[PDB]
């Protein structure tokens, strides 16, 4: 009967490996789950018996061949495999001599120290279980397991890497029942993978000195080409944090070369060239980036990427998507003052986002970043720094056309804190307005400066009384965003009141922004320009002393740029008179 | 150079560009 | 459906994404939305679906996220909701569409997917926004959001054209529980000249055991006693 069970395990292991090497995407996973259910049934048949010593090395061979092909298909380990480990371990314990895996492992390794001749399979089981606890981030007790494996005198070695290196695989793995993978093949993987994860954590925690060692360890040995890239890329960032640009460049270049997937490098390239301020190069890298991200096999084995994590947003291996990036490009461009270019980028952005009905979806920017309306604004703001004002309006038209079916229907207009206006709707109106200024139309402009200002006063934005939806968390709630946006619409108006010659009205509106937001300072400049005209001495000096008594946090992009865009050059020059 | 095996491959890159044996550039660069 | 005893086995050829761990799925246009069981954390997957008459393929996954909200007989259910202009689902009226999900969704003319779950939890997800990679994972809290929590498993979602005055532009979003808290939702725009959603959570008879929507604000539902009907018109 053990003849037939071993013949069956060997048969299904040959099926699995034939499928891994050969075949098409379906027939692969069809034969793989075929073999997984064969191994399931065979494990049930062997686990039916109150295991004998000669039944044990086949049962553990089956447990290994099952767990490997289970987690390589799922493309992740879980705790079902750990319960199956507990099952097989207490099955080894009940033969010769319960509570939990850690003490069960201690007692099973004491039983293995008696040398029953299944240590080939016990070391392979430690590799699987070690991988599990590695993918589960359980690195304290993994030290305890491998510590019990080796001498208990290696107890002070809390670092895993030394401990895994000293842990030898037991044997050349003599003519036993067939296995899909050897303990040393798993040891290699464990080493590079752990090296890798320690390195990333040390990098993100501002220790890119420590990282270099572990990661070079990740370079040296088995590390598949795809990972190799990733590691080097970390190094880009490490030397980048250091100051050492060129080492960085060199690694990055390799990463490119060795790459089939060189999104992430050029992203570090960008950050680097920013650190120099080499704006020209900066933008280029990113352009290239986008086309890169334009263009786009799983073995039934335990490879590294299985044990690798999904990276964070703080990683230098965080690379978004096409659309998300294009946004960066346009964003970055807009801050520099390449407004025209910026626009075209932003329109291409928008084209992508909205027009994508036919192909694969092309997504919007993620919400540590700006929401889909903060963006359209940035679209229209560039279009204003082009002097493309009749476009900037076909945008703010299309915007308030889609979003009618939200808005505040403004009956408080007749009844005139309580109703709600998301900051962005107040602003659309502000910029509709600046747009009309470039096309030179006092009236219909000062329509829009007053119509903003009302939706900043007979509304508060800060109105979530009901969790009714999804919202701008960040951009469109800041009291900083509000007191800066007011201060603007009032500044925007005060100018138009001087273009028509009503220095009384302009005075009112400027004096109002001051009283409101005292740390824009372009507010004080316009008022003191007004005062130097009319009523210099007393007023002016009283506000000098106030400014010098007084002496950016998260302002969203469409407004920053718009403040910079209106603001004047001899501003400090005026404040020193 | 002021910042190992990479720095050797970099001098190899420069040598392949200039058509100079790597020794000449390495010596010149170390001296400078 | 032509498909060249009147009994027929499928061959495993016709298999596509043997993921095995997948409960529930829907269709849009050219898109496939599955919902995959795991350990505790259920994640929603999303695949292309080939628009040309080809080999009937999945493609590569665009999108996965974790229904972090969801931690385990009752098969959860999903729904498609497309707004006006942009098929096996429900279009709303742009007022509602805008009220539930918000601006992002409305702007992008994003078809949105509602998962009810065995708890009773009724979570929606914005399919423009579910595009991710290894270097670019789903955040849960971004991307899936949670509307109302019925405290019993969910049988049925739809939308309903109340005010009746093929692509019908519904005004009212309908959920059901099992023990029979049903949940209609509407547009108000009341008393603040401001949009607020009229909630009720009515509390019907029976175990409820299947539902449907038919011409003009009438739901046709089962008790285990009798086939019963409701008006919302
Ligand atoms: Zn926003």
From Swiss-Prot, chain A:
Q: Where are the TPR repeats?
A: 229-262, 323-356, 426-459, 487-520
Provide one Gene Ontology cellular component. Fanconi anaemia nuclear complex
Q: Name one GO biological process term.
A: ovarian follicle development
* Keywords per UniProt: Cytoplasm, Disease variant, DNA damage, DNA repair, Fanconi anemia, Nucleus, Phosphoprotein, Repeat, TPR repeat
One GO MF annotation is: damaged DNA binding
Relate the assembly described in the record: Belongs to the multisubunit FA complex composed of FANCA, FANCB, FANCC, FANCE, FANCF, FANCG, FANCL/PHF9 and FANCM. The complex is not found in FA patients. In complex with FANCF, FANCA and FANCL, but not with FANCC, nor FANCE, interacts with HES1; this interaction may be essential for the stability and nuclear localization of FA core complex proteins. The complex with FANCC and FANCG may also include EIF2AK2 and HSP70.
What is the name of the protein in this document?
A: Fanconi anemia group G protein
Which species is the source of this protein?
Homo sapiens
Swiss-Prot record, chain B:
- Any idea what job this protein has? DNA repair protein that may operate in a postreplication repair or a cell cycle checkpoint function. May be involved in interstrand DNA cross-link repair and in the maintenance of normal chromosome stability.
**Assembly state and interactors?**
Belongs to the multisubunit FA complex composed of FANCA, FANCB, FANCC, FANCE, FANCF, FANCG, FANCL/PHF9 and FANCM. The complex is not found in FA patients. In complex with FANCF, FANCG and FANCL, but not with FANCC, nor FANCE, interacts with HES1; this interaction may be essential for the stability and nuclear localization of FA core complex proteins. The complex with FANCC and FANCG may also include EIF2AK2 and HSP70. Interacts with FAAP20/C1orf86; interaction is direct.
The encoding gene: FANCA
Full-protein interval shown: 61 to 119 of 1455
Q: What is this protein called?
A: Fanconi anemia group A protein
Provide the leader sequence positions: none
- Recount the PTM note: Phosphorylation is required for the formation of the nuclear complex. Not phosphorylated in cells derived from groups A, B, C, E, F, G, and H.
Cellular localisation? Nucleus; Cytoplasm
The disease tied to this protein in UniProt is: Fanconi anemia, complementation group A: A disorder affecting all bone marrow elements and resulting in anemia, leukopenia and thrombopenia. It is associated with cardiac, renal and limb malformations, dermal pigmentary changes, and a predisposition to the development of malignancies. At the cellular level it is associated with hypersensitivity to DNA-damaging agents, chromosomal instability (increased chromosome breakage) and defective DNA repair.
From Swiss-Prot, chain C:
What is annotated about its quaternary structure and interactions?
Answer: Belongs to the multisubunit FA complex composed of FANCA, FANCB, FANCC, FANCE, FANCF, FANCG, FANCL/PHF9, FANCM, FAAP24 and FAAP100. Forms a subcomplex with FANCB and FANCL.
Q: What part of the full protein is here?
A: 90 to 372 of 881
Q: What is this protein called?
A: Fanconi anemia core complex-associated protein 100
Compartment(s) where it occurs, according to its Swiss-Prot or TrEMBL record: Nucleus
The UniProt function text for this chain reads: Plays a role in Fanconi anemia-associated DNA damage response network. Regulates FANCD2 monoubiquitination and the stability of the FA core complex. Induces chromosomal instability as well as hypersensitivity to DNA cross-linking agents, when repressed.
Q: From what superkingdom does this record's organism come?
A: Eukaryota
């Amino acid at each position: 009967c053990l003849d037939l069970w071993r013949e069956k395990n060997d048969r299904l292991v040959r099926q699995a490996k034939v499928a891994q090497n050969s075949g098409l995407t379906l027939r692969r996973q069809q034969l793989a789950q075929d073999a997984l259910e064969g191994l399931r049934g065979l494990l049930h048949s062997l686990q039916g018996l109150p295991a004998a010593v000669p039944v044990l090395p086949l049962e553990l061979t089956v447990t290994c061949n099952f767990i490997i092909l289970r987690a390589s298909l799922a493309q992740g380990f879980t705790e079902d495999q750990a319960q199956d480990i507990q099952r097989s371990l207490e099955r080894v314990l009940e033969t010769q001599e319960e509570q939990g895996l850690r003490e069960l492992w201690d007692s099973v390794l004491r039983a293995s120290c008696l040398l029953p001749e299944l240590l080939s399979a016990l070391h392979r089981l430690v590799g699987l279980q070690a991988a599990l606890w590695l993918s589960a981030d359980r690195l304290g007790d993994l030290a305890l397991l491998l510590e019990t494996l080796n001498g208990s005198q290696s107890g002070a070695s809390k670092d895993l890497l030394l401990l895994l290196k000293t842990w030898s695989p037991p044997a050349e793995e003599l003519d036993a029942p067939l296995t899909l993978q050897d303990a040393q093949g798993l040891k290699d993987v464990l080493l590079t993978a752990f090296a890798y994860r320690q390195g990333l954590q040390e990098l993100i925690t501002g220790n890119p000195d420590k990282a270099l060692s572990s990661l070079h360890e990740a370079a040296s040995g088995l590390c598949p080409r795809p990972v190799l890239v990733q590691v080097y890329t970390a190094l880009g960032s490490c030397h980048r944090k250091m100051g050492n640009p060129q080492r960085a460049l060199l690694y990055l270049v390799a990463a490119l070369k060795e790459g089939s997937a060189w999104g992430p490098p050029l992203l570090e390239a960008s950050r680097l060239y920013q650190q120099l301020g080499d704006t020209t190069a900066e933008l280029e890298s990113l352009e290239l980036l986008v086309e890169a991200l334009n263009v786009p096999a799983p073995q039934f084995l335990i490879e590294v990427e299985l044990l690798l994590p999904p990276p964070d947003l703080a990683s230098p291996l965080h690379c978004g998507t096409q659309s998300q990036t294009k946004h960066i490009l346009a964003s970055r461009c807009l801050q520099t003052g390449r407004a025209g270019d910026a626009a075209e980028h932003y329109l291409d952005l928008l084209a992508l986002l909205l027009d994508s009905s036919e192909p694969r979806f092309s997504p919007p920017p993620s919400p540590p970043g700006p929401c889909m309306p903060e963006v359209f604004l940035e679209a229209a703001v560039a279009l204003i720094q082009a002097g493309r004002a009749q476009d900037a309006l076909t945008l703010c038209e299309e915007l308030l056309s889609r979003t009618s079916s939200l808005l505040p229907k403004m009956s408080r207009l007749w009844e005139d804190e309580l109703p709600y206006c998301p900051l962005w709707v107040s602003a659309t109106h502000l910029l509709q307005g600046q747009a009309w200024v470039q096309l030179g139309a006092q009236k219909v402009a000062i329509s829009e400066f007053s119509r903003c200002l009302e939706l900043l006063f007979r509304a508060t934005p800060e109105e979530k009384e009901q969790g009714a939806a999804f919202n701008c968390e960040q951009g469109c709630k800041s009291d900083a965003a509000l007191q800066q946006l007011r201060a603007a619409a009032l500044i925007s108006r005060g100018l138009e009141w001087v273009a028509s010659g009503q220095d009384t009205k302009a005075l009112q509106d400027f004096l109002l922004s001051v009283q409101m937001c005292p740390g824009n300072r372009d507010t004080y400049f316009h008022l003191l320009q007004t005062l130097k005209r009319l009523d210099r001495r007393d007023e002016a000096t009283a506000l000098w002393w106030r400014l010098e008594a007084q002496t950016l946090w998260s302002l969203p992009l469409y407004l920053e740029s718009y403040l910079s865009w209106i603001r004047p050059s001899d501003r400090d020059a005026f404040l020193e008179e | 150079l002021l910042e190992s095996s990479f720095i050797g491959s970099a001098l190899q890159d420069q040598a392949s560009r200039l058509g100079v044996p790597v020794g000449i550039l390495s010596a010149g660069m170390v001296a400078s | 459906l032509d498909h060249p005893s009147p009994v027929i086995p499928v061959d495993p050829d016709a298999c596509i994404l043997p993921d095995a761990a997948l409960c529930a799925f829907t269709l849009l246009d050219s898109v496939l939305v599955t919902l995959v069981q795991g350990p505790a954390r259920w994640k929603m997957q999303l695949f292309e679906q080939p628009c040309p008459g080809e080999d009937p393929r999945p493609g590569g996954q665009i999108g996965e996220v974790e229904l972090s909200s969801y931690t385990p007989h009752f098969l959860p259910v999903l729904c498609s909701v497309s707004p006006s202009g942009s098929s096996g689902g429900f279009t709303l009226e742009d007022a509602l569409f805008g009220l539930l999900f918000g601006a992002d969704a409305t702007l992008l003319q994003s078809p949105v997917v509602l998962c009810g779950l065995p708890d009773g939890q009724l979570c929606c997800v914005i399919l423009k926004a579910l595009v991710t990679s290894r270097s670019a994972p789903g955040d849960p809290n971004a991307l899936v959001k949670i509307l109302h929590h019925l405290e019993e498993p969910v049988i049925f979602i739809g939308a309903l054209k109340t005010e009746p005055q093929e692509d019908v532009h519904c005004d009212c979003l309908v959920a059901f529980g099992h023990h029979g808290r049903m949940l209609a939702i509407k547009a108000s725009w009341d008393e603040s000249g401001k949009l607020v959603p009229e909630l009720r959570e009515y509390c019907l008879p029976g175990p409820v055991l299947c539902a449907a929507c038919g011409g003009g604000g009438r739901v046709y539902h089962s008790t285990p006693s009798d086939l019963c009907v409701v008006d919302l018109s």
